[PDB]
Swiss-Prot record, chain A:
Entry PTM: Ubiquitinated by the ECS(ASB11) complex. Ubiquitinated by RNF128, leading to degradation in a proteasome/lysosome-dependent manner.
Protein name, per record: Dolichyl-diphosphooligosaccharide--protein glycosyltransferase subunit 1
Record text on subunit structure and interactions: Component of the oligosaccharyltransferase (OST) complex. OST exists in two different complex forms which contain common core subunits RPN1, RPN2, OST48, OST4, DAD1 and TMEM258, either STT3A or STT3B as catalytic subunits, and form-specific accessory subunits. STT3A complex assembly occurs through the formation of 3 subcomplexes. Subcomplex 1 contains RPN1 and TMEM258, subcomplex 2 contains the STT3A-specific subunits STT3A, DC2/OSTC, and KCP2 as well as the core subunit OST4, and subcomplex 3 contains RPN2, DAD1, and OST48.
Annotated tissue distribution: Expressed in all tissues tested.
Numbered residues of crosslink Glycyl lysine isopeptide (Lys-Gly) (interchain with G-Cter in SUMO2): K82
Cytoplasmic-side segments: 2-151
Cellular compartments annotated: Endoplasmic reticulum membrane; Melanosome
Family: Belongs to the OST1 family.
Domain of life: Eukaryota
Modified residues (N6-acetyllysine): K82
UniProtKB/Swiss-Prot annotation, chain B:
Entry's Gene Ontology cellular component terms: cytoplasm; endoplasmic reticulum; endoplasmic reticulum membrane; membrane; oligosaccharyltransferase complex; oligosaccharyltransferase complex A; oligosaccharyltransferase complex B
Source organism phylogeny: Eukaryota, Metazoa, Chordata, Craniata, Vertebrata
Coiled coil segments of this chain: none
Quaternary assembly: Component of the oligosaccharyltransferase (OST) complex. OST exists in two different complex forms which contain common core subunits RPN1, RPN2, OST48, OST4, DAD1 and TMEM258, either STT3A or STT3B as catalytic subunits, and form-specific accessory subunits. STT3A complex assembly occurs through the formation of 3 subcomplexes. Subcomplex 1 contains RPN1 and TMEM258, subcomplex 2 contains the STT3A-specific subunits STT3A, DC2/OSTC, and KCP2 as well as the core subunit OST4, and subcomplex 3 contains RPN2, DAD1, and OST48.
Species for this entry: Homo sapiens (Human)
Protein's UniProt name: Dolichyl-diphosphooligosaccharide--protein glycosyltransferase subunit TMEM258
Curated annotation (Swiss-Prot), chain C:
Function: Subunit of the oligosaccharyl transferase (OST) complex that catalyzes the initial transfer of a defined glycan (Glc(3)Man(9)GlcNAc(2) in eukaryotes) from the lipid carrier dolichol-pyrophosphate to an asparagine residue within an Asn-X-Ser/Thr consensus motif in nascent polypeptide chains, the first step in protein N-glycosylation. N-glycosylation occurs cotranslationally and the complex associates with the Sec61 complex at the channel-forming translocon complex that mediates protein translocation across the endoplasmic reticulum (ER). All subunits are required for a maximal enzyme activity.
Coiled coil: none
TM segment ranges: 14-34
Entry protein name: Dolichyl-diphosphooligosaccharide--protein glycosyltransferase subunit 2
Organism of origin: Homo sapiens
Compartment(s): Endoplasmic reticulum; Endoplasmic reticulum membrane
Tissues in which the UniProt entry reports expression: Expressed in all tissues tested.
Lumenal side: 10-13
Whole-protein coverage range: 584 to 630 of 631
Segments on the Cytoplasmic face: 35-47
Domain of life of the organism encoding this protein: Eukaryota
Family: Belongs to the SWP1 family.
Curated annotation (Swiss-Prot), chain E:
Pathway it works in: Protein modification; protein glycosylation
Primary role: Subunit of the oligosaccharyl transferase (OST) complex that catalyzes the initial transfer of a defined glycan (Glc(3)Man(9)GlcNAc(2) in eukaryotes) from the lipid carrier dolichol-pyrophosphate to an asparagine residue within an Asn-X-Ser/Thr consensus motif in nascent polypeptide chains, the first step in protein N-glycosylation. N-glycosylation occurs cotranslationally and the complex associates with the Sec61 complex at the channel-forming translocon complex that mediates protein translocation across the endoplasmic reticulum (ER). All subunits are required for a maximal enzyme activity.
Subcellular location, record wording: Endoplasmic reticulum; Endoplasmic reticulum membrane
Any one GO CC term of the record: oligosaccharyltransferase complex
Membrane topology label: Single-pass type III membrane protein
Principal place of residence: endoplasmic reticulum
Keywords carried by this UniProt record: Endoplasmic reticulum, Membrane, Signal-anchor, Transmembrane, Transmembrane helix
Cytoplasmic side: 26-37
Protein's name according to its UniProt entry: Dolichyl-diphosphooligosaccharide--protein glycosyltransferase subunit 4
One Pfam family of this chain: Ost4
Any one Gene Ontology BP term: protein N-linked glycosylation
Lineage per the UniProt record: Eukaryota, Metazoa, Chordata, Craniata, Vertebrata
Disulfide bonds: none
Amino acid sequence: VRLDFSITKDPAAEARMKVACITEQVLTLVNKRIGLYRHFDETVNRYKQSRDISTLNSGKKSLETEHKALTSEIALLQSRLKTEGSDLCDRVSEMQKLDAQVKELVLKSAVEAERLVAGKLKKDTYIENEKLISGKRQELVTKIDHILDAL
Amino acid sequence: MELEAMSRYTSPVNPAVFPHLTVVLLAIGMFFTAWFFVYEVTSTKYTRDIYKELLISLVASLFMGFGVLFLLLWVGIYV
Amino acid sequence: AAMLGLMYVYWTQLNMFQTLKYLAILGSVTFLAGNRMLAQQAVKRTA
Amino acid sequence: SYEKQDTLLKLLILSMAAVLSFSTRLFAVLRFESVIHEFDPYFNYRTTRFLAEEGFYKFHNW
Amino acid sequence: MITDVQLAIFANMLGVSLFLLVVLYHYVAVNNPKKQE
């Protein structure tokens, strides 16, 4: 499998292959963005258990650093895919446009948890706001998974 | 050093045991072999890593090699 | 050239198994050199 | 990844088909003996054991 | 030794499993997006 009996390259198949490698990398980084949102949601649960804001503030800053790095690397790889003419670049842009709203919904979820623990939000309202936020989050995640299938 | 004073030997793998080991080891080797070939046929010049292929192949070799042995003993072609 | 010359030695002296035991080696080396040379020529042609 | 599952299912199907093809022809050996059947196969057997003993050039001139 | 009845059963079960798995393969094929893009 290592040896190759080839003479003339086909750079189009090389592009079809590099694009696939980079798309698997991007898919992994996106799965780590979801995993970072799961880390952050765990951090919100830990916050509710602890009522310690420093835990969740450090969670927020670690998110807005590592998720930001993932986004930057995504966009740089997307610049490679754009150079390869891939119709998938603008759809990774679309996924990042959705994930930015998922991010703002996560920030709203953290804000509503902070208000609940601070007593600025009442449980019967927190429940409905959570159900709406996580509902539209799940909708956005379903869109994300369909666009990832569109890659 | 004369007959009646000495000891005796037999294989600690007893007659009844081989039918189990052969099945277990061959099942494992078939698992890792399928994994090996699926990994090789799917992965590509940018996505393969030697050390994974080597570990999977070495494990599948170990298990298959000993499974076939116990299979041939179970058949009774005693080596 | 040696591959084509071997056919005279086969016609005159060798049997088939000896002929193939030489032609395997000589075709392998000729194929490796031909592939490399043809790749070079293909690049030069396509440049 | 979808390509892995398609490859796995192809491999599994084809290996089952091979094992079935080999195994379904053993009935005659299980019922009696690992021995050659019919009349005509015996000439192929004698000639095969000849070639296996005397070598090609003595089989061809045979 | 294994009898020809145990072989006949084994072969019947392999046959059934094979054709059921192929009838699964056709679903895993038709559901593929990439086969129809």
